[PDB]
């Protein structure tokens, strides 16, 4: 039986009995991310080189914002574009904050990199006025988070309690169609994806678990390497194909590079419903309490065995 | 002044006076690019999965069919056919065409940017039409390039007039001419290779590679970039700059890429955007094939990166 | 602020406290209609034509297994289909949708304007579902619309809070809601019927006219439109007023159009829109169908153009 | 084998060993007409409703085949039915050809999504004369080339040429026209009649008796069957399709009928004509109507030849 994104979540919302809040909001965010996905493909270039005589983060980001306001479901929205939390006005607020990277990737967009959304969603802890506070929740409170990437082919991957699911874009008729259900992680992979330009700079526990891959002490087939340098498009790659994906912390950057609230966090949530893992090096990435909204973290993903196995070379240099 | 694909072709074709065989080959292979392009970013797949109740094959016999009924073509070489494909008399015409017609699909299933990649060459004997029409050097292509199927969908084509890239706008199925007469930069930052087979590397590679980590006139460090698709791959360095790798290996070693259909169009692209490629030994443009399929090392990007590798490589013999 | 078709339907749902399947059920229609959409632009056509080496069949079947797999549905009736569909009895819910999955579709050589019909009622008793479930009057609807494929694609939707209209953005494949609240003007100027018949219609029709274009007040003659397609007549007499009729006369004492899924749909639309719609002798909505097929004469639009038409009817006995 | 518009003009272009221009004008005038349908279909039109939160169409449509044409290097003299004046164009863009067009007929009725179309005919310029309006008035024999697009419920563009008349009907998956129908030729005689029949007070006699006869036929044949949908590119097209007979005529109070000669009934006639049908006046055949006027009316009956010749029997008839 065919199944959409739209009638998947209504579906899961009745069997949860909710009052439809949630859905209202995925279903906006769904909205967005297909007007984000035909700026992305160029829709409408020609007008601006002149066939009849604002950049895209930014429109990536008022799609969001316009979007997940309109849904009457939201109270306070964190952006990778905006300094400060945006609190929703007072007739249009709902019981859930959203943090989201609208255009992750973005920097490298003149070269056509694939890009991506990013998203997490949480509820809204306390009865007080809202305020950014609301936003500092650690990872493990999340109530769903994903994912789209504007790739070969626009995808959205969507990870709730029921487990992590793949949504293919028709833009023939702009919906998105269920193709993977309940995806689920390989234990080991054969592929590990990081900025190796950066190798002067490493923590030596990084350097030794990236010489085991290269150069396997036992008998086996090395690592192949991957780095798109765009982050929805490397941790797909991870969770389709297993593997491993790093941006480690250092002495030079002692909390990572990577935003917690809106990378790391709804990745490792992915992640850990299918079954794999997140972790800073000292704990797993969705048990750090936040304090600061745009508060960097390590990050190191993919499949159990090869975060494992970093995680024990880790400790030996501990 | 607007400018699209096809009006561009149409231009220059004129302007040099030509009978319009090549023009009607570049127009049908864009009709066959644009078609790519639409299965690729996955249109009509609901029907696939039931709401009525294969890529590179499909990708393979778009572009054969629309270069066949161009009546331009007289052969046809393939990644997807063992042989070269001979147009059947009443449609020959005086072009060979070598394409890789959906680069990268292997990895299609994680949505990574794929591509497609064609030379064409003036057939050069009097000869009935055959494969060894399509051994030429790649010195000889009179046109190359790649349509790249990333974030948004671009045609790079270079000919003798230089490189230029045209946007696919997907609400008018139309390429619109954004970047003229493109040049690579002199010199970048970043380096592009599997580093996944650095056992096997080489010496001159380990170095070379080992000096954009480590750098000796303490510089910055070069960023790494790794698609493993290589038209996304070259795309970035024509356009960022810097230099990619696909060198020997102990499972490949004559390289691993296809010399007709990947290295030499995107050769010709990077020599006529004022970059460089090499095999270490030669320009990759002066390789004489001797097989349709045959393999070659590949060292492309911007001229001062590339001249740095060759080098370290002459000091390794 | 911006509204989609989605989020205004769940938004209505959650006012009404409903359970949510006529939520899903309108989704599963609205994705069916899209699809409608694309197939009637033509998209992926090149295909049918060789580039690589049925319509209202397409149509119903897309209906069809949307609203089944909505999971809120148990009987549905087509023009397509001679009897009822019965849901299987895992995918049952509690709707009846009666629809013409592409009306207009006979002269859709010449490109005219089509369209979807398409009325929603609420199961009858809880016995097992049949044909008999659908043989409501039409004031029993629940909801009731058309989605117009013209110039651009629009989906009508009346309910108990009244007409609202979307327009499809096909480039992202949305709804917008870009009229709301929609009430037909008191009167009009335009008369739409096929006059070709001219020589059997019933007296009455033959002097309303006569009016039209020869008034007798003095005041101007309206203007005539006839496109031949139900869904582009109603909607253009939703939108600019005036009236549209398909009477009864010697030879179809009962008209021609159908009631269940094009009379009652258009009527229930009109008469949320403040406008009428009648049979000659009853309004269309209190007509007691007993075979889902039948035929029914209808007119409707402008308030005071059918009430006007009913004068003479009346006249005429 | 597949083809494609500009393939298809090409293809026709290298037999006649043309310099080009033709080919080039026909292209760009295909890509404008592919902006329009994407623009009337109502691409990107959540974000005129507030989606992260501009042109009137018939406007944007003047512009885009105005712009398209402009930078052909093929024309030197533009009439639209937007502009009072021709256009002339600039020295260094200038060529050899004349277009008349009208960029998105119908669209008066646009707000209730009615079939709207793009129509345009194409002149060789003749004089050696600094370009201008009078080069635009030439009688509709001299066109070269002459068709339409039809914004329905798919796109078709329609091309006449001396070879004959080729449909292509848009794919927009990926943005091509594809030949669907080869060489068409209307029916000799068909089964519908076309015209607004609300200005039936103002009727000639002769048309409100050619009309009593389609409805109460004396021989007693069955009656025609009767449809207007108020846009001239759909309702002749539809004629070309199913046969029949469109009318716009002439009457009092219009002696000179409501259509446009230059880039309405032209355009259309050299279609029909090419097809095998008709196209008059009353008077005259309406291609050979020397114009005077660029925004000159013209009345105009037109399709299958035998429905032409039975009106001009009954119009003959009332002198
Ligand atoms: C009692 N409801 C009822 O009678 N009808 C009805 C109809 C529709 Br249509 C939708 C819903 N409910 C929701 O949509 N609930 S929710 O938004 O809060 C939600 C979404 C998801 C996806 C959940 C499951 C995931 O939880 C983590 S929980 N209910
Ligand atoms: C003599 N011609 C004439 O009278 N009219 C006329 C009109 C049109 Br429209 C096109 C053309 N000619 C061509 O298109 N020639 S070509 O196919 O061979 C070609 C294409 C490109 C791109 C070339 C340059 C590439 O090599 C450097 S060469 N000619
Ligand atoms: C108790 N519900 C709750 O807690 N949450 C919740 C969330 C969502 Br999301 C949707 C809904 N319910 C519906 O959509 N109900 S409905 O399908 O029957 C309906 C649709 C329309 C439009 C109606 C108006 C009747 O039209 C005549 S009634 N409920
Ligand atoms: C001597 N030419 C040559 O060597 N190569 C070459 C290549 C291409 Br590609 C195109 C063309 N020529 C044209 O396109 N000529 S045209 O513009 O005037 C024209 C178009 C149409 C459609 C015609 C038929 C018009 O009938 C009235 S005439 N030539």
Same mark, same amino acid.
């Given at each position: 039986?065919?199944?959409?994104?739209?009638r998947?979540?209504?579906?899961?919302?009745?069997?949860?009995?909710?009052?439809?809040?949630?859905?209202?909001?995925?279903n906006?965010?769904?909205?967005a991310?297909?007007?984000?996905?035909?700026?992305?493909?160029?829709?409408?270039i020609?007008?601006?080189?002149?066939?009849?005589?604002?950049?895209?983060?930014?429109?990536?980001? /008022?799609?969001?914002?316009?979007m997940? !306001?309109?849904?009457?479901?939201?109270?306070? =929205?964190?952006?990778?574009?905006?300094?400060?939390?945006?609190?929703?006005?007072?007739?249009?607020?709902?019981?859930?904050?959203?943090?989201?990277?609208?255009?992750?990737?973005?920097?490298?967009?003149?070269?056509?990199?694939?890009?991506?959304?990013?998203?997490?969603?949480?509820?809204? !802890?306390?009865?007080?006025?809202?305020?950014?506070?609301?936003? =500092?929740?650690?990872?493990?409170?999340?109530?769903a988070?994903?994912?789209?990437?504007?790739?070969?082919?626009?995808?959205?991957?969507?990870?709730?309690?029921?487990g992590?699911?793949?949504?293919?874009?028709?833009?023939?008729i702009?919906?998105?169609?269920?193709?993977?259900?309940?995806?689920?992680?390989?234990?080991?992979?054969?592929?590990?994806?990081?900025?190796?330009?950066?190798?002067?700079?490493?923590?030596?526990?990084?350097?030794?678990?990236?010489?085991?891959?290269?150069?396997?002490?036992?008998?086996?087939?090395?690592?192949?390497?991957?780095? @798109?340098?765009?982050?929805?498009?490397? @941790?797909?790659?991870?969770?389709?194909?297993?593997?491993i994906?790093?941006?480690?912390?250092?002495?030079?950057?002692?909390?990572?590079?990577?935003?917690?609230?809106?990378?790391?966090?709804?990745?490792?949530?992915?992640?850990?419903?299918?079954?794999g893992?997140?972790?800073?090096?000292?704990?797993?990435?969705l048990?750090?309490?936040?304090?600061?909204?745009?508060?960097?973290?390590? @990050?190191?993903?993919?499949?159990? /065995?090869?975060?494992?196995?970093?995680?024990?070379?880790?400790?030996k240099?501990?």
């Amino acid at each position: 039986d065919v199944n959409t994104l739209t009638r998947f979540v209504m579906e899961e919302g009745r069997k949860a009995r909710g009052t439809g809040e949630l859905t209202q909001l995925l279903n906006s965010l769904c909205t967005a991310v297909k007007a984000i996905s035909s700026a992305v493909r160029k829709a409408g270039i020609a007008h601006l080189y002149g066939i009849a005589g604002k950049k895209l983060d930014v429109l990536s980001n /008022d799609l969001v914002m316009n979007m997940l !306001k309109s849904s009457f479901a939201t109270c306070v =929205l964190v952006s990778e574009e905006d300094k400060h939390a945006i609190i929703v006005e007072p007739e249009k607020r709902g019981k859930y904050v959203v943090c989201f990277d609208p255009l992750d990737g973005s920097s490298n967009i003149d070269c056509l990199v694939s890009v991506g959304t990013i998203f997490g969603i949480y509820r809204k !802890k306390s009865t007080d006025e809202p305020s950014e506070k609301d936003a =500092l929740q650690p990872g493990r409170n999340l109530v769903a988070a994903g994912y789209a990437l504007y790739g070969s082919a626009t995808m959205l991957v969507l990870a709730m309690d029921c487990g992590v699911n793949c949504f293919m874009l028709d833009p023939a008729i702009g919906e998105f169609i269920l193709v993977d259900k309940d995806v689920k992680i390989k234990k080991k992979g054969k592929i590990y994806s990081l900025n190796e330009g950066y190798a002067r700079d490493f923590d030596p526990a990084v350097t030794e678990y990236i010489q085991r891959k290269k150069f396997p002490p036992d008998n086996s087939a090395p690592y192949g390497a991957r780095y @798109v340098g765009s982050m929805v498009a490397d @941790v797909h790659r991870t969770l389709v194909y297993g593997g491993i994906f790093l941006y480690p912390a250092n002495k030079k950057s002692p909390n990572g590079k990577l935003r917690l609230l809106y990378e790391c966090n709804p990745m490792a949530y992915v992640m850990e419903k299918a079954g794999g893992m997140a972790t800073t090096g000292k704990e797993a990435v969705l048990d750090v309490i936040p304090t600061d909204i745009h508060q960097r973290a390590p @990050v190191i993903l993919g499949s159990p /065995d090869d975060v494992l196995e970093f995680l024990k070379v880790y400790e030996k240099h501990s």
